[PDB]
Amino acid sequence: DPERRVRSTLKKVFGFDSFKTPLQESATMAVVKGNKDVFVCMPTGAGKSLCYQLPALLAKGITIVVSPLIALIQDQVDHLLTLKVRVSSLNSKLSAQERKELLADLEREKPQTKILYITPEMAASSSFQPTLNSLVSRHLLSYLVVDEAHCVSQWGHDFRPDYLRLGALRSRLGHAPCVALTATATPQVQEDVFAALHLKKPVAIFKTPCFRANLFYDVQFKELISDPYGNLKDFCLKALGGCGIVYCRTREACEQLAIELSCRGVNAKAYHAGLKASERTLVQNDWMEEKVPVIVATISFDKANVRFVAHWNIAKSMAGYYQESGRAGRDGKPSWCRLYYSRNDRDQVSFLIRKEVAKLQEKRGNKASDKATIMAFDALVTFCEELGCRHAAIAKYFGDALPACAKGCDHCQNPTAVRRRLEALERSSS
Ligand SMILES: Nc1ncnc2c1ncn2[C@@H]1O[C@H](COP(=O)(O)OP(=O)(O)O)[C@@H](O)[C@H]1O
Ligand SMILES: [Mg+2]
Ligand SMILES: [Zn+2]
C-alpha cells in the first residue's frame, strides 16, 4: 500500500495531514512509482519541492537535485535540516574538511546522504565524474531532479548555457527516472525542456491550468471614449460593492490619474520609483490598511480583496499582463480586469522594447532571446485586436485546454458589443 507509506511520510516528516491540491498528490505518486520521466508545471508557492523531496526519502538510494544558484540551494538545505532530513550540498563554498567528509560518505556501500543539491556547473565538471560513475555502477542513484527547468530555454526569462550540458548528463543515467519542474507554462518552454534534458517518452505531465474563473476580462479602446477619466472612475466605483489597481507606463500619467481620480470621488495615491523610499512604504501601508482604496502604479511592491485591475496602457508582454491582472480576486469572489488599448500606446510600447533590445545588443551582442521579447508583446496586441473568448486566448498562449467561460468575458457576455467597438476602431484608420 504505497499511498499509506506516502501519507505517513507526509505527516511524520513534513508535518502535513493532506496534499495542498490533488495535482500535487498525483505528481508525488507518479514520482514514487519510478517508471517514467516526470514534468511538473505549477505556480510559484504551489508546493513543487515536495513532489521530489518526499519520494527521495522512500527510495533506496540517493536523489541528485540540480538548481541554478547556491543562495536558493542553501534555503532548501536549511529547511530540510529542521525536518531532520539527511540533506547535503556539494559546491564551491565547502571547506577542505566539509568536501572530504561528504565525498567519503558517498563512497560508503550504504551512504547516509539521501538528497544532494548541486549547481549545473558542478554536475557537468570532470572532477564530479568519478563520484557519479561509482554511484551509477553501484545502483545508488534513485532520481535526477532538474529544478527551474525553464533555464534550458531562450524563450523563458532565465536562460543559462550551463543547463544545456544537463542533457548529456541525463543520457548517462538511464536506470534513474528524471524529474523536471518549472512555473513557466508556455508550449515552447515545455518543448525545450523535453528536448534539452533528453527526457524519455511518454512523459508524465502535471500541469496547473492558467484559467481563473472568477475574473471578468474586457478590452476598451481609449480612442472611442469621450471622457477617459470618467470611464476609469465609473469602472473603479462599480467594481467596489475592497480595493483596486490601475497600471500605467509613465510617472507623469501615474500622478495625473491619482489626482484626477481623487477629484472625481475615488481616493487614489500614486506609486512610482521617482518618490522617496520613506514615502514608498507609507503609500504601501495605507493601501494595505484600506485607508486608500486605489493605488495607481508603474511598478509593484499580496492583497486578497482586489476587486479590480485596470491597465491604463498596454503591458509589455502576455505573461506580464497575465501576472498583473492575476493580482485580482485572490479571495475567489468575483473581480474585474480591464485593458485600455490604443494603437498610439501600442506604437509607444513597441518602440520602447526595441530600444531596450538595442541597448542589450550594444552591451553583449546578438542573442536568440532578442526575438522572444518582441513576440511576447505581439501576443498581447493580438489579444487586444482579436474577436474571441478572453480566457481561451490566455489558455491557448499557455498550452491549456479550452476553458469553461460561463459568460466570464466581454466577448462571451455579448459578442455583438465587442464586434461594434472593433468595427469603429478598424474604420477610423481610413
Ligand atoms: N502538502 C502541503 N500542505 C501545505 N503546505 C505545503 C505542502 N507542501 C508544501 N507546502 C508548503 O508550500 C510552500 C511553497 O512550496 P514550494 O516548494 O517552495 O513551492 P514552489 O517550488 O512551487 O514555488 C512551502 O512553504 C512548503 O512547505
Ligand atoms: Mg521551487
Ligand atoms: Zn469568455
Numbering used by the authors: 11 to 251, 260 to 319, 324 to 452
Q: Can I see the authors' text?
A:
RECQL5 (also known as RECQ5) is a member of the RecQ family of helicases, which are highly conserved throughout evolution, and function in many diverse cellular processes with the role of maintaining genome integrity. Specific roles have been established for RECQL5 in almost every cellular process involving DNA, including transcription, replication, recombination, chromosomal segregation and DNA repair. The Zn2+-binding domain consists of a pair of long antiparallel α-helices (also known as the helical hairpin), followed by series of short helices and loops, from which a cluster of cysteine residues bind in a typical Cys4 tetrahedral arrangement to a single Zn2+ ion.
In an attempt to improve the diffraction properties of these crystals a new construct spanning residues 11–453 was produced and crystallization experiments were set up with and without nucleotides as above. In this case crystals were obtained in complex with the nucleotide ADP/Mg2+ in two different crystal forms, both of which diffract to significantly higher resolution (1.8 Å for the monoclinic crystals, and 2.0 Å for the triclinic). The ADP bound structures were solved by molecular replacement using the APO form as a search model, with two RECQL5 monomers in the asymmetric unit of the monoclinic crystals, and four copies in the triclinic crystals. In both cases, the electron density maps are of excellent quality throughout and the structures are very similar, although slight differences remain in the domain orientation and conformation of various loops which are discussed in more detail below. Similar but less dramatic differences can be seen when comparing the six independent chains of the two ADP crystal forms, which can be grouped into two distinct clusters of three which are separated by maximum displacements of up to 9 Å. Looking at residues at the interface between the two domains, a clear correlated difference can be seen in the conformation of residues forming the aromatic rich loop (AR loop). In the more open form H167 and D168 are pointing toward motif II, making water-mediated interactions with T194 and H160 (conserved residues from motifs III and II respectively), while in the less open form H167 is pointing away from motif II, forming a water-mediated interaction with Y419 (part of the Zn2+ binding domain). In the ADP complex, the ADP moiety is bound in the active site, making extensive interactions with residues in the D1 domain, several of which belong to the conserved helicase motifs Q, I and II. The most prominent difference is in the relative orientations of the D1 and D2 domains, with the inter-domain cleft almost completely closed in the APO form and considerably more open in the ADP bound form, with maximal displacements of equivalent residues of up to 30 Å.
